[PDB]
Design a protein around this nucleic acid. Structure first.
Ligand SMILES: [Mg+2]
Ligand SMILES: [Mg+2]
Ligand SMILES: [Mg+2]
Ligand SMILES: [Mg+2]
Ligand SMILES: [Mg+2]
Ligand SMILES: [Mg+2]
Ligand SMILES: [Mg+2]
Ligand SMILES: [Mg+2]
Ligand SMILES: [Mg+2]
Ligand SMILES: [Mg+2]
Ligand SMILES: [Mg+2]
Ligand SMILES: [Mg+2]
Ligand SMILES: [Mg+2]
Ligand SMILES: [Mg+2]
Ligand SMILES: [Mg+2]
Ligand SMILES: [Mg+2]
Ligand SMILES: [Mg+2]
Ligand SMILES: [Mg+2]
Ligand SMILES: [Mg+2]
Ligand SMILES: [Mg+2]
Ligand SMILES: [Mg+2]
Ligand SMILES: [Mg+2]
Ligand SMILES: [Mg+2]
Ligand SMILES: [Mg+2]
Ligand SMILES: [Mg+2]
Ligand SMILES: [Mg+2]
Ligand SMILES: [Mg+2]
Ligand SMILES: [Mg+2]
Ligand SMILES: [Mg+2]
Ligand SMILES: [Mg+2]
Ligand SMILES: [Mg+2]
Ligand SMILES: [Mg+2]
Ligand SMILES: [Mg+2]
Ligand SMILES: [Mg+2]
Ligand SMILES: [Mg+2]
Ligand SMILES: [Mg+2]
Ligand SMILES: [Mg+2]
Ligand SMILES: [Mg+2]
Ligand SMILES: [Mg+2]
Ligand SMILES: [Mg+2]
Ligand SMILES: [Mg+2]
Ligand SMILES: [Mg+2]
Ligand SMILES: [Zn+2]
Lengths: 52, 86, 59, 50, 134, 135, 122, 158
RNA sequence: CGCGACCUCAGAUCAGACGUGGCGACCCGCUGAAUUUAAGCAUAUUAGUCAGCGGAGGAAAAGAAACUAACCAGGAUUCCCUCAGUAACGGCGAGUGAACAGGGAAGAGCCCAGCGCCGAAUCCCCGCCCCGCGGCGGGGCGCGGGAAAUGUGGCGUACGG
RNA sequence: CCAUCUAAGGCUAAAUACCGGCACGAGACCGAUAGUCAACAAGUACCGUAAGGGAAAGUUGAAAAGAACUUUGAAGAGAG
RNA sequence: CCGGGUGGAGCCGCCGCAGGUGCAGAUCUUGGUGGUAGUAGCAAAUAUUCAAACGAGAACUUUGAAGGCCGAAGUGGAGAAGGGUUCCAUGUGAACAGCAGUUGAACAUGGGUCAGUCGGUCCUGAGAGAUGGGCGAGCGCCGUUCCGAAGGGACGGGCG
RNA sequence: CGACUCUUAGCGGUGGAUCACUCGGCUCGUGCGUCGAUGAAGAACGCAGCUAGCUGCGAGAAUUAAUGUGAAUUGCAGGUUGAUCAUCGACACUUCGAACGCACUUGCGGCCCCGGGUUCCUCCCGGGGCUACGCCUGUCUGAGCGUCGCU
């Protein structure tokens, strides 16, 4: 049927929690290399380029 | 006697081709079509047979006026004008 | 001739008289089992139907 | 029968003309998948309704 | 990436639209690139092909530097026939083999007045783009 | 009333539906008069109707019909709601006065069963299941 | 020579019929050739003469109906084939004067109280 | 059959509910269409505020809510009469009018009267003929500093 | 007797228009079951559902209170969330089952009859001229014809006039 | 006592609905015994007096280049 | 999992997610194939034989001869209904005609049905069925002279 | 040994599974929201050089005109001042069907006009325009021991 529950609501505190945890993990070099991004020559992992 | 021998007497005809729907369902003694109900002004249709409804409906035939209606609608039934000549 | 199905014997007579410049004696019509109507047009005795058919193009 | 309605005769005329085989030049068309006429009616086998 | 919500990217829709295209859309699909010299002459990269363009086959078995005129633009099987691009049957009669115009380089056009009008229109729109970019 | 037109008074079911004789029609005889007048003069729109007399066997109603293609009605700005195609056969949809009195329409606590536009609309809106995306 | 519609419009009625029945008699001769086993050069011309007949008859009917509706342009009652063929519902609709017709009371109301243009400072 | 300790349930699924099931897969489509209709309305009434006319302060009835005030349907005719506004020009300069509403107390009457006099103080009225200003119309400085207001016009607070 | 009004009722291939029939997903008006559940079954339930009939539109219906309320009161209709599986109905069994208040989406109101006053001030149609003429409309002239005083139009409608 | 409306006449957009139609777009769907009955000359062939019932059936190859010529046989069918 | 072969264009490992997720059965559904089995059978209505022809080929086609049967309530000559080109001529022998076939009602090419007097057409029969009227929520139904202003016709006279 | 039978492998048949493809569905969503007495929906019969079906079309019949386009169509023939395609606003649109002169047989009419015929005087034949029900406004002819008035 079409009226299978396709959609799942997540609590807002948990959605912000997961954004916080994923951001926090995107600053540790082991976890992003274990994700497989080739970063073995980037000069700093929270890689902030200036606003130009 | 009620089977093979009694099938031999089948030489009359209950129905004929209808002048409205074209099917061989025009009952001759009743003078009425058993598919479209010809002497009645309204077409015989029933909601208990949707397959029979979709066998002869507006999609099924030639649409020789309505496919032109559907085309003239897209320019809003513009009439009395031509394209600009050479 | 093969004629139109709606055409009468009178119409077949006047059509042949106008088209091929002749005068006919009688017209027989039948409708062939393919649906086309066929007309046997008998010409008047002063005309020669072989010469008329040669002028039409059939021989 | 030999006694016939004009409408019955014209119906028989159409169903006579539809009972011929396919011409062979159809067979060499580009997007052809048509090989023989599957709408052939034999008078002894199938009986036209009517 | 396509952003237009009226242009479909559906594979079966694109294939149906390609294989059931009418002949004046087929003419645009049956388009061949011009040569390098014809590109620098007319500022036109691609052109629909006609019954008299002198072309080169560059992909296939009949590729090479030989030049032949198109003799027939067979739009229904999406192919063209070129002069010496042929093969022999069993009985010794030569037949023309179909070549897609995307594998075809035009070295000499049939320049009609319609063709010159199309060439000027394509060159002008290309230059409008080039002078819009700066 | 409306005698139930079953052959020989036999309604083949449970005894709650065995009623034949003392049943009543949901619309009034005045609205029956309007629909007979409209279905005869289908080229005219039923406006209203009223009672003019009765005896034991008949009721008599005068129905006001209107011709929407006459130029007086077609060119009076105060009367041209009936010229519009939505007012075809008002008497058959119950949009006249004696037609709307039978539908249970009205305002307030006596007419909670026609919230929406009808018994149809109320029953549809209440006997539905709103299955949301996120529940 | 080919028969085009462009060179047919400048002609008159009797010469259009003279072209037409010439096409009809050569079509009849082409059908005679068709049943007498004639050549493909003549069996190809059956379509050519048929569409030429179609062209001449189309020119005749187009010119004739243009002349009739030039005659009927200023009349209160024109024939039903000359009336505009919209849908039946749009022919049943009100006309533009009648949809622009307003009650004198309501006209007094929009003259007295027009919808003003305003803005609200926050 | 029931098992051990549990609730007695009455699910209302004894009808043919599956014909009349209303899924909400067109919910973001309805939201996106309602949004575009809202911006089309706001673009059409270009200096007039987007939410609509000004609505009065009403006390909710029926003791659960009678401490809370909210926006009513329209200013009542005696509120417009005390504010000195004609009941037909009110809807033309953007005031909601409720003929049906009575007053029973002085203070809600006076609060909505002061709301009307606070709204006419903020009302920047464009002249009816654009190249000719008239007697009560706003001046060309507030015409050039007119903006379209968002949200309810002077929103109601507790 | 005869002529003429009026009323009522005919006839016409009289002049001009309009309806029929189709589609029918959604909508309106009627009509309307039984399978089923109650571990049987008859009220109930299924269900104002299917089938049947009529009528539409691009939406329909509804709609500006003979309303809700009992409050410090709200304010057309429609729709969503909640009210609420609640008040209530029910072999008070099986089961059925709203409404108001509240938050929103939207948001818009108005018109007659009647009562009154204005020399019927009102409407329709044919003739001529000019314009516009493919939504048959505008201006003027007709000692042109009807309708209408058994009441048309202008003002005016409960918020009062 | 009080409160609230003013029935038995009429019109009215928007929010609302939309498994028919016209034109689209999409998919954690199905992949020819699946997905619509119907990927194909499908509401077709065929059946029933009738109301009605109702299929099977995609794929050479890149390109027909679809096997000229020789030979056996009446040929189908072979061998080259 | 790898090796070999065939095939000719896509596929899989790991972390999670989702399910129309695993077959021996349901007298399961659809399709295909066995044993039975070269078996049962090609036995109702007396009957075929000789020579020749054509043909690659003859128990069966054709011709001749012979012997027979139907025996005028026919195994004859013709129509109704029904069938619809089966009728006719030529060609073919792939498929069908339960052996064969050089033959056919098969297949493919072309042909063929001519009316004032023969029938329909016209009449009314048993009946069917509108309008009027009545009934009916309604599509409509009853009704057929019945709660009808049901005649549009004609000769003569006058007038243009 | 052999024949027959059984098992396994190789090769070959029978059969069409599997896999890989996919101009098709299914579901969801957006915009528009339009049939008909000016004859719809539907049906019948015809129309191509070779054409049965499908499709397109209507005696102008696999299409006419106009516009856009700009050299094909193609299975085989044949024959740029615009081939073919698309658009489609011009024109046309057989018979039936609400179906409409009466009937449903392709039967029978009636009125008006035109052409042959005639020598309009009828006939006869051909062609064109009308002839259905209900209903609205208006017109004319009328009906009534309906109500009056006048003489
Ligand atoms: Mg009988
Ligand atoms: Mg119906
Ligand atoms: Mg038989
Ligand atoms: Mg009821
Ligand atoms: Mg409405
Ligand atoms: Mg009441
Ligand atoms: Mg247990
Ligand atoms: Mg808003
Ligand atoms: Mg008339
Ligand atoms: Mg039980
Ligand atoms: Mg039980
Ligand atoms: Mg029981
Ligand atoms: Mg119930
Ligand atoms: Mg129903
Ligand atoms: Mg209708
Ligand atoms: Mg509509
Ligand atoms: Mg309403
Ligand atoms: Mg409310
Ligand atoms: Mg709760
Ligand atoms: Mg209930
Ligand atoms: Mg509420
Ligand atoms: Mg008055
Ligand atoms: Mg007034
Ligand atoms: Mg009021
Ligand atoms: Mg009132
Ligand atoms: Mg009211
Ligand atoms: Mg398959
Ligand atoms: Mg497969
Ligand atoms: Mg399938
Ligand atoms: Mg295969
Ligand atoms: Mg491949
Ligand atoms: Mg799955
Ligand atoms: Mg198995
Ligand atoms: Mg044996
Ligand atoms: Mg055999
Ligand atoms: Mg024979
Ligand atoms: Mg004789
Ligand atoms: Mg009857
Ligand atoms: Mg396979
Ligand atoms: Mg053209
Ligand atoms: Mg062109
Ligand atoms: Mg008869
Ligand atoms: Zn029928």
């Amino acid at each position: 049927k079409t009226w299978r529950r396709w959609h799942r609501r997540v609590n807002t505190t948990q959605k912000r929690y997961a954004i916080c945890s994923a951001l926090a993990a995107s600053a540790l070099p082991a976890l992003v290399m274990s994700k497989g991004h080739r970063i073995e020559e980037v000069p700093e992992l929270p890689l902030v380029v200036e606003d130009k | 006697t009620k089977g093979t021998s009694s099938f031999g007497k089948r030489r009359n005809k209950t129905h004929t081709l209808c002048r409205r729907c074209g099917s061989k369902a025009y009952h001759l003694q009743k003078s009425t079509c058993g598919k479209c109900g010809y002497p009645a002004k309204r077409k015989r249709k029933y909601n208990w047979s949707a397959k029979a409804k979709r066998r002869n409906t507006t999609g099924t035939g030639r649409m020789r006026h309505l496919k032109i209606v559907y085309r003239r609608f897209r320019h809003g039934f513009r009439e009395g004008t031509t394209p600009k000549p050479k | 001739f093969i004629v139109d199905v709606k055409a009468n014997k009178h119409q077949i007579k006047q059509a042949v008289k106008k088209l091929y410049d002749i005068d006919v004696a009688k017209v027989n019509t039948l409708i062939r089992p393919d649906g086309e109507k066929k007309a046997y047009v008998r010409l008047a005795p002063d005309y020669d139907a072989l010469d008329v058919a040669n002028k039409i193009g059939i021989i | 029968s030999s006694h016939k309605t004009f409408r019955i005769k014209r119906f028989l005329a159409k169903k006579q003309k539809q009972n011929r085989p396919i011409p062979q030049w159809i067979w060499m068309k580009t997007g052809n998948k048509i090989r023989y006429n599957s709408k052939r009616r034999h008078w002894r086998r199938t009986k036209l309704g009517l | 990436m396509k952003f237009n919500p009226f242009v479909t990217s559906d594979r079966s829709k694109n294939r149906k639209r390609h294989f059931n295209a009418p002949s004046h859309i087929r003419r645009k699909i049956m388009s061949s690139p011009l040569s390098k010299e014809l590109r620098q002459k007319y500022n036109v990269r691609s052109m629909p092909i006609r019954k008299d363009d002198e072309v080169q086959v560059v992909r296939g078995h009949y590729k090479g530097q030989q030049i032949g005129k198109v003799v027939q633009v067979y739009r229904k099987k999406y192919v063209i026939y070129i002069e010496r691009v042929q093969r022999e049957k069993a009985n010794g009669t030569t037949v023309h083999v179909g070549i897609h115009p995307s594998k075809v380089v035009i070295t000499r056009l049939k320049l009609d007045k319609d063709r010159k009008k199309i060439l000027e229109r394509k060159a002008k729109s290309r230059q409008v783009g080039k002078e819009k970019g700066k | 009333g409306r005698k139930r037109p079953v052959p020989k008074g036999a309604t083949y079911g449970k005894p709650v539906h065995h009623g034949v004789n003392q049943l009543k029609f949901a619309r009034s005889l005045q609205s029956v008069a309007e629909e007979r007048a409209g279905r005869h003069c289908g080229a005219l729109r039923v406006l209203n109707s009223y009672w003019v007399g009765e005896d034991s066997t008949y009721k008599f109603f005068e129905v006001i019909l209107i011709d929407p293609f006459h130029k007086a009605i077609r060119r009076n700005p105060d009367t041209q709601w009936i010229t519009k195609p939505v007012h075809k056969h008002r008497e058959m949809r119950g949009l006249t006065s004696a037609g709307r009195k039978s539908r249970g329409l009205g305002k307030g606590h006596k007419f909670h069963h026609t919230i929406g536009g009808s018994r149809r609309a109320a029953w549809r809106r209440r006997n539905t299941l709103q299955l949301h995306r996120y529940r | 020579a080919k028969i085009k519609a462009r060179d047919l419009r400048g002609k008159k009625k009797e010469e259009l019929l003279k072209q037409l029945d010439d096409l009809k008699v050569e079509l009849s001769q082409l059908r005679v050739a068709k049943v007498t086993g004639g050549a493909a050069s003549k069996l190809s011309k059956i379509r050519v003469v048929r569409k030429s007949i179609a062209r001449v008859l189309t020119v005749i009917n187009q010119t004739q109906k243009e002349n009739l509706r030039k005659f009927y342009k200023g009349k209160k009652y024109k024939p039903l084939d000359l009336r505009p063929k919209k849908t039946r519902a749009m022919r049943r609709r009100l006309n533009k004067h009648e949809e622009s017709l307003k009650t004198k009371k309501q006209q007094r109301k929009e003259r007295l109280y027009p919808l003003r243009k305003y803005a609200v400072k926050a | 059959a029931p098992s051990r300790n549990g609730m007695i349930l009455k699910p209302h699924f004894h009808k043919d509910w599956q014909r009349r099931v209303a899924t909400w897969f067109n919910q973001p489509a309805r939201k996106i269409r309602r949004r575009k209709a809202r911006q089309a309305r706001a673009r059409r009434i270009a200096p007039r505020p987007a939410a609509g006319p000004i609505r009065p302060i009403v006390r909710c009835p029926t003791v659960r809510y009678h401490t809370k005030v909210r926006a009513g349907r329209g200013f009542s005719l005696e509120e417009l009469r005390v504010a000195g506004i004609h009941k037909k020009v009110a809807r033309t300069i953007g005031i909601s009018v409720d003929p049906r509403r009575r007053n029973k107390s002085t203070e809600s009457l006076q609060a909505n009267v002061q709301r009307l006099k606070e709204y006419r103080s903020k009302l920047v009225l464009f002249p009816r003929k654009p190249s000719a200003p008239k007697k009560g119309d706003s001046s060309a400085e507030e015409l050039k500093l007119a903006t379209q207001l968002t949200g309810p016009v002077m929103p109601i607070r507790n």
